[PDB]
Amino acid sequence: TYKFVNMREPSMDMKSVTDRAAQTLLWTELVRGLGMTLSYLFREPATINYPFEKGPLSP
Amino acid sequence: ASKVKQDMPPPGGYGPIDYKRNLPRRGLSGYSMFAVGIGTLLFGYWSMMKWNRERRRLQIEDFEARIALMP
Numbered sequence: 001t002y003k004f005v006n007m008r009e010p011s012m013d014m015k016s017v018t019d020r021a022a023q024t025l026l027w028t029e030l031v032r033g034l035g036m037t038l039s040y041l042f043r044e045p046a047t048i049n050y051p052f053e054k055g056p057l058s059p
Numbered sequence: 060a061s062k063v064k065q066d067m068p069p070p071g072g073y074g075p076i077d078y079k080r081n082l083p084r085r086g087l088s089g090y091s092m093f094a095v096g097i098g099t100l101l102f103g104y105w106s107m108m109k110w111n112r113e114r115r116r117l118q119i120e121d122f123e124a125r126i127a128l129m130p
């Protein structure tokens with residue numbers, strides 16, 4: 001069993017072309033990436049307070 | 060006495076594990092985005108129209124005061 005990663009064909013109707021043009025001219029995906037980075041700032045950092053805290057070890 | 064005890068999955072196995080790509084579409088048509096842009100442009104144009112006409116009238120008033128004071 002195998003999969004295709006990049007075998008999609010963009011639709012050529014007027015609405016889809018207009019959507020792609022709006023993406024080009026208004027930077028929708030750039031704003032989406034900015035939005036993920038913003039959301040990701042508002043969560044707890046993963047940093048521990050060495051040397052007062054120590055990483056987990058095992059026997 | 061004691062029986063075998065080693066790391067095993069729990070009876071019935073584990074729950075399902077998500078692996079499919081999940082990139083949902085936030086959703087707004089190009090028509091709607093362009094219309095919002097054009098609408099805010101039109102509102103700004105109208106507001107600037109009224110404000111700049113008022114500014115012209117104010118400038119004419121100031122010029123009249125200067126003309127009255129000139130002699």
Ligand SMILES: CCCCCCCC/C=C\CCCCCCCC(=O)O[C@H](COC(=O)CCCCCCC/C=C/CCCCCCCC)COP(=O)(O)OCCN
Nearest residue numbers: 023024025026027028029030031032034093096097100101
């Ligand atoms: C009825 C009369 C109305 C009067 C006319 C008005 C109509 C306006 C409709 C269109 C206006 C849109 C123009 C705005 C800018 C467009 C420029 C543009 O789209 O360029 C992009 C490129 O733009 C970029 O990608 C630059 C991004 C660089 C990274 C910076 C990220 C910034 C995004 C975060 C938000 C930024 C906020 C900006 C506003 C700040 C306000 C102070 C195209 O390049 P490509 O997609 O690579 O392809 C071109 C070859 N075919």
